Every structure is written in structure tokens, then in C-alpha cells.
């Protein structure tokens, strides 16, 4: 009962959270 | 972007290739590019000293034959199998030689089809070129139509 429904926004296009360095064998 | 991208050779500079480099350099000691690792080694200096800076700015491998054999080995393989099975007569102290022959037969055959890819590849290229050449031709004849339909549509 805080407000009513819960505000969507879900996002994978954001800045980024993952890096990358163990690509090499 | 009139700024070029880095040279295509960059893709070879993986950490896996870097690890393999020291051993490769050794083995080597025991344009001639043959594998990926060769790109991690600076190119040789040309002979023409014109790269020195002027200053500062601050037998035909007959296949008609290979197909002959291939056709032979195949019959030979079939007979030899016909014997192992018992359709054709053979004394038991041969039975295993038949099996010997089949293994050997099937091997040689493999080496043949194996040696036939180059000639195979070409027929494929000649098959692609043919195909795209037919496509483009069509593309034009399609443009042509439009110009003819515009003539029809214009005259009614």
C-alpha cells in the first residue's frame, strides 16, 4: 500500500557493469 | 570516419597466442606467412634502402585418373566384401586377409576423395561466380522492365 503498482524501468542497454580480460586462452 | 581502423593483424594478438610465442620462436630457429603466430613477429626489413627516412617531420594432378582408381577400389572393395560374407567362395585362411583388404581399401578411397577437394573447390567457385553473374544479369533485366513498364504506363 506504499503507492499502488510498482514502477517498471528494467534495463540491459544501461552504461555497463561487466569488464573483460580473461578472453585469452 | 576518414580515420582508419587499426590494421587487420590486431586480431591475432590474443593472450593465448602471446603465450605460445616463446616456444614458436624457438622452433622457428630450427613474405612467408603460414600461421597466426607469424604476425606476432615483426616483418623483415626490405632490401631497397629507399625505406630509409630522407629526414624528419616534427604437372597436372590428373583427376580423371583419381576417379578411375576410386571406381576400381570400389569394385575391389565390393568383391572382397562379397567373399567375406560367403556369396563368393574363399578358404578360411584368407578370411582375415579379406578383412585386411577391406580396411586397406576403405583407407585408400579416403585418401582419394581427400585429394579431390582442390578440384572440388574450383567447381564450387566456378559455381558461385556463375550464380552471382546470373543474379546481377537478372538485376539489370529487372531494372530494364521497370523502364518498359513506365513506357507502357505512360502510354494508355
Amino acid at each position: 500500500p506504499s503507492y499502488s503498482p510498482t514502477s517498471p524501468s528494467y534495463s540491459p542497454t544501461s552504461p555497463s557493469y561487466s569488464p573483460t580480460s580473461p578472453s585469452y586462452s | 570516419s576518414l580515420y582508419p581502423p587499426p590494421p587487420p593483424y590486431v586480431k591475432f594478438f590474443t593472450q593465448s597466442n602471446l603465450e605460445k610465442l616463446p616456444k614458436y620462436k624457438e622452433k622457428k630457429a630450427a613474405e612467408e606467412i603460414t600461421c597466426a603466430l607469424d604476425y606476432l613477429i615483426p616483418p623483415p626489413m626490405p632490401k631497397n634502402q629507399q625505406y630509409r627516412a630522407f629526414g624528419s617531420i616534427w604437372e597436372s594432378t590428373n583427376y580423371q585418373y583419381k576417379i578411375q582408381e576410386l571406381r576400381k577400389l570400389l569394385k575391389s572393395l565390393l568383391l572382397n566384401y562379397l567373399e567375406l560374407i560367403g556369396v563368393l567362395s574363399i578358404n578360411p585362411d584368407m578370411y582375415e586377409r579379406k578383412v585386411e583388404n577391406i580396411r586397406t581399401i576403405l583407407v585408400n578411397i579416403h585418401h582419394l576423395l581427400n585429394e579431390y577437394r582442390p578440384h572440388q573447390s574450383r567447381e564450387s567457385l566456378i559455381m558461385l561466380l556463375e550464380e552471382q553473374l546470373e543474379y546481377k544479369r537478372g538485376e539489370i533485366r529487372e531494372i530494364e522492365q521497370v523502364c518498359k513498364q513506365v513506357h507502357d504506363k505512360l502510354t494508355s
Binding site: 573483460t20 | 591475432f12 623483415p44
Partner: protein
């Protein structure tokens, strides 16, 4: 017209383009090329030009200095997750 460049020719042309500060910038503030160590490793490989007989082919001497800087920077440079080079985020 001349045939397509040799690898030696391609690398000599390329190392020398790094003498242009703007271009080096356009690279430093790329995204993709810093995700993987490839480019970083390539630039260290290119230091082969810094010694003879190679260096005697360099017309644009600054590119060697900039390569050296560029290289030493990279070792301690922190790479963001996207590719963004961290130590540069404030600049354009």
C-alpha cells in the same frame, strides 16, 4: 597505381599515424578496442620500430615518443567494463 601494401608497409604507415595527437585521441576514446587486450598488445609489439634498423625508416619521430607514452600509460590504465578507458572519463 601500386599493389596493396605489405605488412611492413602497413605497420610503418600505421605507427607513423600515431604522431597525430587527434587521431591517437580518437582511438583512446574508442569503446570496442579496449574491451580485449588485442590492440593494447599490438601497440607494445609495435615498439619494434624504436630500434635499428627499423627506427631508421621513421620519418615522423614523434610517433615513437607517443607510442612509448601510450604504452606505459596502458599498463597502469584501468579499463572500464564497456571499454571506456577509466583515467580519461572526465575529458571529451
Amino acid at each position: 597505381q601500386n599493389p596493396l601494401p605489405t605488412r611492413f608497409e602497413v605497420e610503418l604507415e600505421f605507427i607513423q599515424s600515431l604522431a597525430n595527437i587527434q587521431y591517437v585521441t580518437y582511438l583512446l576514446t574508442q569503446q570496442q578496442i579496449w574491451k580485449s587486450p588485442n590492440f593494447k598488445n599490438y601497440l607494445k609489439y609495435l615498439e619494434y620500430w624504436c630500434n635499428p634498423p627499423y627506427s631508421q625508416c621513421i620519418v615522423y619521430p614523434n610517433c615513437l615518443f607517443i607510442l612509448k607514452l601510450l604504452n606505459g600509460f596502458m599498463e597502469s590504465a584501468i579499463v572500464n567494463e564497456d571499454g571506456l578507458l577509466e583515467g580519461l572519463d572526465e575529458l571529451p
